[PDB]
Amino acid sequence: AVEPFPRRPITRPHASIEVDTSGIGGSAGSSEKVFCLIGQAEGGEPNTVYELRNYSQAKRLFRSGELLDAIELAWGSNPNYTAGRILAMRIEDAEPPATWADKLDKFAHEGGYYIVPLSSKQSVHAEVASFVKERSDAGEPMRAIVGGGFNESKEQLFGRQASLSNPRVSLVANSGTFVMDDGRKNHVPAYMVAVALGGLASGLEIGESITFKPLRVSSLDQIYESIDLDELNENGIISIEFVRNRTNTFFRIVDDVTTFNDKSDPVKAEMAVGEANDFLVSELKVQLEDQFIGTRTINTSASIIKDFIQSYLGRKKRDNEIQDFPAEDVQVIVEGNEARISMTVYPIRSFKKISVSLVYKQQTLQA
Amino acid sequence: AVEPFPRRPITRPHASIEVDTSGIGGSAGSSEKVFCLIGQAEGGEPNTVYELRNYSQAKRLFRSGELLDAIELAWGSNPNYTAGRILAMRIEATWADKLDKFAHEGGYYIVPLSSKQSVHAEVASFVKERSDAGEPMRAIVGGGFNESKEQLFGRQASLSNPRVSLVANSGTFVMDDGRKNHVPAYMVAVALGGLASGLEIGESITFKPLRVSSLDQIYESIDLDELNENGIISIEFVRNRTNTFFRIVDDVTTFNDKSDPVKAEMAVGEANDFLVSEDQFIGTRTINTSASIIKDFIQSYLGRKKRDNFPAEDVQVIVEGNEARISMTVYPIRSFKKISVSLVYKQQTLQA
Amino acid sequence: AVEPFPRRPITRPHASIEVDTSGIGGSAGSSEKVFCLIGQAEGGEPNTVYELRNYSQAKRLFRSGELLDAIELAWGSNPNYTAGRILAMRIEDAKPASAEIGGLKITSKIYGNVANNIQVGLEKNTLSDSLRLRVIFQDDRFNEVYDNIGNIFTIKYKGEEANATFSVEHDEETQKASRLVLKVGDQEVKSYDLTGGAYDYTNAIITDINQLPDFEAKLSPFGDKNLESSKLDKIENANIKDKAVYVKAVFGDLEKQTAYNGIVSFEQLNSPIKTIEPFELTKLKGGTNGEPPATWADKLDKFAHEGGYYIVPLSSKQSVHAEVASFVKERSDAGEPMRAIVGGGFNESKEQLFGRQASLSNPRVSLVANSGTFVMDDGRKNHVPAYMVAVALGGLASGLEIGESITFKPLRVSSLDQIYESIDLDELNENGIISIEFVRNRTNTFFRIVDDVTTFNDKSDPVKAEMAVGEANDFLVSELKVQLEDQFIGTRTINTSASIIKDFIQSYLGRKKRDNEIQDFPAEDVQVIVEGNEARISMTVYPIRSFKKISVSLVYKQQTLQA
Amino acid sequence: RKKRDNEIQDFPAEDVQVIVEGNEARISMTVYPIRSFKKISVSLVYKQQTLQA
Amino acid sequence: ESITFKPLRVSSLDQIYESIDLDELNENGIISIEFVRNRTNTFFRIVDDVTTFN
């Protein structure tokens, strides 16, 4: 803005100052991913959302229940990365709830992106799928991560992935044994592994894949063979590989394939680039809206909007949230009611194939 | 005019000086958009239009009444803008005879502090009677404390006029005494009129914030679209951020028509009310003419001028009855309501 | 100006000088961040703003009330900075104590219930033919006596004639002395007009009369007494032949000698006028405080055009906070920038602090969360509501330089009622509430001010979010307005005027850079256009900013060592 | 001389034009008069600079 | 040379006009004397040299 000093005008001879702050006013940084959990628990009032920052704070707001273990796994499984905020909600009817759709809505305008329901029921999975679709269509992009029960055959997994083929749901096959800060080792259903994967994905930078990131678990109940893992990957089911040929044995997340059945478009198939797309569109929308709508269509606006877009995309390039963009494709056309804007973006892709061609050749040494 | 010195004429030998002052005259600029209010107060002498310049003077003349709360909101919604003059009158039923008193007080926006539809119709009639004269005006009005969408539509249809806007929402303002003052929607209309008076000539209140504490009703996107399309102003509670705030959705007018911006959108109507508009060669210099050679001549002229300093597709010529009207198109400054972004994902081969 | 010598011109052949002083005049330095408090206390005139420079002066005006404790914290909190002036005002209305006796009004110069302990008493000294006045007041251990009161000068007649008398004429219109008359025998020998001309002072009459052979005159034995001759007391036919008659003024001598008395002022009852007569000692009565005012708005108005920048009201009431918020706003908008700092009660929950911050969002107000204890110069350890901590923060902010932030500075506080975890200080800061951090990781443990955030939530604009930047802006634009006003308005548009203004602006910004009140100015961006009746000036300024983040990226690298 | 005393601001020399006819001198001139300052408007643009070492 | 903002030397003024009062009188072409109060030094300015012409 620009402001007069004094604010009240003066008629008689005087000096007055007009001051412009746009050059020092800040700007919104890169948005933050926040992780959402819905859980059976003991503790605080049900059906309200708590922002949580510390395990101690969580262990005061909640006690002795699977939600608190889920929060523990969510922070503990990503040691290398900054521990983000978590949004958590106990659920009980004011007895077991018949439906969660009535409660999921209380997340709707929270600043939250990844959802995990702490239950195995396919109906709950469908409910959260519908909710994530709803909010995305409303313009609040979200994703869900989903998992089975304690132990499931490939047949059951394929059945579930049939029941939910969706670009905003991911299914986690493996269930395993974790080790807890309480000095406890517990067998858990696969959705707790999905909690771990959501913690890692929400910790990672925007547009960074969970594929081939390590996972920390005491054991897995199902150790899938190479053909088994290829089968599940073809079906768009996330699987955990036990690395055995290395001297050190550890568990990899094999891939970040969504449950969606068509692999031809990566923006729908792969979580990372879909997330990058979601954040890029959301930030473009909200920033252009608050920047320009209602402003006067002064003759130079065709410059100013191009300069704004080029600045924004330069900032996106700086953070490695896009690969590159052509500056000259940023083009603006102004008509009396409307700004019409064109841009090209090169998005950032994770490496998923490396092909080495090795040519043996002779050289004649001589002396 | 040119001044003779001496003023008296003289015929004996003398010198006289003629002074052309006209190269220095000024103050030719516009009026400011003075704001106008009518409503209940204590203390002030009824049916007298007072100029007010600060809230202390207001509390000195008016007291203990809704007009002073209105003056407060009228300067409280726009703290980051010039706090300009306000015109206000205590009214102690027909209102036209009172509104007549504003007729030669140079103020552009008026709000009646009443929800009664007869009052609003009177005010619209007054705005018409003034604006068809040489002194344009506009009005803003609002409903009661809570009115349904169908009531608001019925009101807008009954009050459908290109110089009146209806505001739907009502809410609570924190006053400078700290009171949580719950107010009917016409005080929100006062707040919007204050903002619109503070903004520059042909700035627009769309997507400006409203410094209000809460709203009686929160409308979802479909209801905001419904009210906007019906030409009713509505306030959005912006929920997509931790920094939540209230936003004026649009500056629509109770006359809604897609075919004319000037009657649909308040800011362009104001621009038209305030915009300003800006060489001859005679046929005796030529044996005969036509609109074709008139057009080509004036194109050659303005080509030379624009080279020193216009598109042939944008000048029209009509010749009639020894007279030629040459009509240029001109482009005024509007304000963006739509932004359309086409985002194309390419991919690129890197090499090293 | 260019000054002519002589000022009056000459039209003979002559020489004349024209001196230009404009090269040596200097200009005013950076404005004082005078600090303002409004407070209850005993003593001092109600609704009066006092400039204060010493705590001794304050404790003489204000008698141990909470205002004096606030002034104590305001100076005492950070002694490594030069002490500022303070503006102080007493909130409650308070009547002085008074009495009526002996023909006189007696009135206290102090105000409030303490004044009812004043007592005064008046008696005849029958040896000096004088009054004697006692004044005693216990609360200060004050006791003073004034004696030989009333006698001012004397006349003796030393002629051989039997009859000689002194007389003073009334002026029944005014009760003043109209004339002095000396009679010898059946006639006046000499007489003087007392209420005008050369004899309007007693000393001049004493000087003149001593010239006459038969008469001689002298001042009173005690003290040093002179009066406007109008105040001479009515005396008739006093036989100056037998003995040296003392001429008297009673009320005039009371007035004159008590002029420097700080405890009691005297006025005379009426027209007929009552004779001054001795009376048994009486206490003063009716001095009292009233009820505390329901609104402070009309009292905060008294600080208007008192050139002080930070205000703290000594109250926890939200209504008072909204009042001072409005006052700060209106003074700012009228071109007298201000800020207020505000605090809660004794210990109030975090929900209540968010309540206050939501109810009072304004970029010119700040709210202080913590409440705690201080150790006073009296040696008390006292427990104080958070607005007294806000007083301490205001004293610091007024002690720091212009734009020097209170962010991350030590607070000389003994303890806090609430010590907040990291996350609670995070949340209070995010909501724009000032808090005090107990730094435990050091061996020396001490209290830091967490941040100087204002209560205005939107962090987007630093001139709104941060006190230091808003302060620097306010002083910049204020000193620009006032100096361009006094330097150039009404001056002629000489053909060079734009260059002169450009030089003046560059000089000013050079000073602001020198003093570290801006980071820099690109001097090429200073542009001035003069067009007819006005100048338009444009300048670029890089504002001074406190550090509030440091990021270190630390890269390990191997090194190969060989020998 | 008027310019020297700051009684006018300036004048264009080339606008001083004289036409002579048998009875009459006809004289043209332009003057820029001198005005007191009655308005001063300051526009202040805050801007950032990146210091580095 | 204008008398506007030149100093004036007077012991006191009977009517001290407020800022709005001075603006009103200046609009009406009436010369008014302003009591400068915000400066440490208090003095009287001649506000303007407006003639009575409308």
mmCIF file of C-alpha atoms in Angstrom, chain C residues 304-305 307 336 481-483 485-486 489-492, chain E residues 1-6 36-39 43 45 47:
data_model
loop_
_atom_site.group_PDB
_atom_site.id
_atom_site.type_symbol
_atom_site.label_atom_id
_atom_site.label_comp_id
_atom_site.label_asym_id
_atom_site.label_seq_id
_atom_site.Cartn_x
_atom_site.Cartn_y
_atom_site.Cartn_z
ATOM 1 C CA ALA C 304 -1.646 15.988 23.244
ATOM 2 C CA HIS C 305 1.196 18.282 22.094
ATOM 3 C CA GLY C 307 6.142 15.759 22.798
ATOM 4 C CA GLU C 336 1.871 13.470 16.278
ATOM 5 C CA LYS C 481 7.560 17.188 7.545
ATOM 6 C CA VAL C 482 8.624 19.569 10.322
ATOM 7 C CA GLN C 483 11.945 20.518 8.732
ATOM 8 C CA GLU C 485 7.867 23.090 6.647
ATOM 9 C CA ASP C 486 10.166 25.407 8.555
ATOM 10 C CA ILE C 489 7.301 26.968 2.990
ATOM 11 C CA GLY C 490 6.682 30.598 2.056
ATOM 12 C CA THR C 491 10.114 30.996 0.450
ATOM 13 C CA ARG C 492 10.326 32.317 -3.098
ATOM 14 C CA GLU E 1 8.150 37.970 -0.985
ATOM 15 C CA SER E 2 5.228 36.440 0.896
ATOM 16 C CA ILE E 3 4.210 36.969 4.520
ATOM 17 C CA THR E 4 3.096 33.326 4.714
ATOM 18 C CA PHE E 5 4.963 31.414 7.458
ATOM 19 C CA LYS E 6 6.839 34.552 8.469
ATOM 20 C CA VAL E 36 2.854 26.738 16.901
ATOM 21 C CA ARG E 37 2.722 24.240 19.770
ATOM 22 C CA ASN E 38 4.432 20.991 18.734
ATOM 23 C CA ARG E 39 7.871 22.617 18.581
ATOM 24 C CA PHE E 43 5.618 31.102 18.465
ATOM 25 C CA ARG E 45 3.014 32.133 12.419
ATOM 26 C CA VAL E 47 -0.708 31.192 8.165
#
